[PDB]
Structures are given as structure tokens and as C-alpha cells.
Write a protein that binds this ligand. Structure first.
Ligand SMILES: Nc1ccc2c(c1)NC(=O)/C2=C/c1ccc(C(=O)O)cc1
Lengths: 268, 9
């Protein structure tokens, strides 16, 4: 039974989505209970035909930088996803709203953990396709970040993608112009948007013309090394963008804080 | 300036 295994609390988050706070009765494990309407499901996969989101979550459900799927149920008109819920958390979007531009030491720690998480997805055959501050939780006690909402993701492939369901203002210019992209280089573009967002306090681009324009104006004081990493991630030509390895070897990325150090210095 | 969320889709 579904209503017998979990105590169901209130709605979580900040729109047209249905995710409830919950606790697992077996052991009081905090959980997030996500309801997905069958009629709204974009892509389907198979294990038993299930939403692709379930397939992707199972593939990455090993490592703590990605949300863990604990279980799922099918219902007449919906699927229900039981996700392991960290607490206390705030998502990175609200975190940046309240604190403004992050100090580079903090953005370095956050960005590094996002890189490790995305690398984990790719190693598991999963492309998230909606990397953004709204899809990142911060465990305020442990200083650990969690990538959430794989509802726009896809199996990772090396050929061209011609569909996209993520966030337009994080999507790369080859998607804007030609409605095609490759997975890794598109991911790196969104990581550039994300890094700018962290060190400047908001995303750089709001309109298609800015996205394809290939000019990055810095509205806050940002180190030359960080600016260079950001501009590299936002190279207009996909093959000019860095690989994950090049990102993590960039001089701006050296001497990262551990998660616990991050929490003690910046979150406690 | 106005910072805002952006829904997926
Ligand atoms: N702003 C905000 C957003 C999300 C959550 C939150 C606050 N507090 C939480 O515990 C969340 C849990 C959670 C975990 C996974 C998923 C998903 O994979 O879609 C959604 C929500």
C-alpha cells in the first residue's frame, strides 16, 4: 500500500508541480513524494513501461550528489516517486536570491560538487538536461549539494539531440538557432550559465538574442580566472567548450573546500 | 533588477 508506508506532510518547493514532504514509517526517514500525471509525461521508458524519469533515477541511484530514488508506485492516472529528502535544505535559487552574489570560495565549492554530480550522471548513462540553481538543493548542515528533478533528462548518447524540455535561458545557442545540440557540450553551456549565476547573483541572459550573441558582461567583481572559465564554458561553438576534465583542471577550480568545511565557514 | 525563476518547457 502507498498511504500505509508513508506519513504524508505538506507540499514542497517553489508552481504546477506536486511534491510532498513525507516520512517513511519504517524508520522515520525523511522522504520527498513526487506525483507525476501520466497524461503529462513526455518520454516513456521500459524496465514494465514507466516514465523515463524513473529509468534515469534508477540508473544514478548508487554517491550522494544526486537525488536518490527509494521506490515508486503506479496508479491509474499517475506515478508516485519516493525520493530521499535531505534536511535541512534550501535550493540554490533561493539561496542566491537571499545572499546575492556568492564569494568565489563558496561558488568554487558549490560548482565543484555540481561537476562531480553531473560526471556521475554521465558515467551512469544519464543526461540531466536541466542543470540550474532551481534544480540544486543545499544540505545546510553537511554542506553537500544534490542535483534534483530528472524530469527533463534523457539517456546519454553521442549523436545529436533534436528535442529539449529543460530551461530555455540555460540552453545553448545551437539549440536556439538550429534546434539541435550534443549532450555534453550543451551541459557545459548550462554549467557556464550556472557559474555566472553564482558569482554575479543572477543568470547572464534572459532573451534569445543575448544567448546567441556571445557576449558576457560581468555585473559584479569576478576574478580574471573565474571570468575566463565562464567565458570558456559559454563558447558559442560547442567544440570550443571545455570538457569536464578541463573544467576541473582550470586554475580557478584548485584548492576546493571540502563539504564540511563549506558548511562550517559559509552555512553555519 | 528582477531576478526570477524560469519553468522548464
Ligand atoms: N525549493 C525546494 C525545491 C525542492 C525541495 C525543497 C525545496 N525541499 C525539499 O526537501 C525538496 C525536495 C525535492 C527533491 C527532489 C525533487 C525532484 O527530484 O523533482 C523535488 C523536490
Amino acid at each position: 500500500p502507498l498511504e500505509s508506508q508513508y506519513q504524508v506532510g505538506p507540499l514542497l518547493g517553489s508552481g504546477f508541480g506536486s511534491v510532498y514532504s513525507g516520512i517513511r514509517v519504517s524508520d522515520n526517514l525523511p522522504v520527498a513524494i513526487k506525483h507525476v500525471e501520466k497524461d503529462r509525461i513526455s518520454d516513456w521508458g521500459e524496465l514494465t513501461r514507466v516514465p523515463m524519469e524513473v529509468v534515469l533515477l534508477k540508473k544514478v541511484s548508487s554517491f550522494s550528489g544526486v537525488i536518490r530514488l527509494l521506490d515508486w508506485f503506479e496508479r491509474p492516472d499517475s506515478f508516485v516517486l519516493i525520493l530521499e529528502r535531505p534536511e535541512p535544505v534550501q535550493d540554490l535559487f533561493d539561496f542566491i536570491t537571499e545572499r546575492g552574489a556568492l564569494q568565489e570560495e563558496l561558488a568554487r565549492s558549490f560548482f565543484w560538487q555540481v561537476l562531480e554530480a553531473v560526471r556521475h550522471c554521465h558515467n551512469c548513462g544519464v543526461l540531466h538536461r536541466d542543470i540550474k540553481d532551481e534544480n540544486i538543493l543545499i544540505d545546510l548542515n553537511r554542506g553537500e549539494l544534490k542535483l534534483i528533478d530528472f524530469g527533463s533528462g534523457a539517456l546519454l548518447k553521442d549523436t545529436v539531440y533534436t528535442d529539449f524540455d529543460g530551461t530555455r535561458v540555460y540552453s545553448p545557442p545551437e539549440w536556439i538557432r538550429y534546434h539541435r545540440y550534443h549532450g555534453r557540450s550543451a551541459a557545459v553551456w548550462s554549467l557556464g550559465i550556472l557559474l555566472y549565476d553564482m558569482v554575479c547573483g543572477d543568470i547572464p541572459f534572459e532573451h534569445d538574442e543575448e544567448i546567441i550573441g556571445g557576449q558576457v558582461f560581468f555585473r559584479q567583481r569576478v576574478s580574471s580566472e573565474c571570468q575566463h572559465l565562464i567565458r570558456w564554458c559559454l563558447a558559442l561553438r560547442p567544440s570550443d567548450r571545455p570538457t569536464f576534465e578541463e573544467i576541473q583542471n582550470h586554475p580557478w577550480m584548485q584548492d576546493v573546500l571540502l563539504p564540511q568545511e563549506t558548511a562550517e565557514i559559509h552555512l553555519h | 533588477r528582477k531576478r526570477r525563476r524560469h519553468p522548464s518547457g
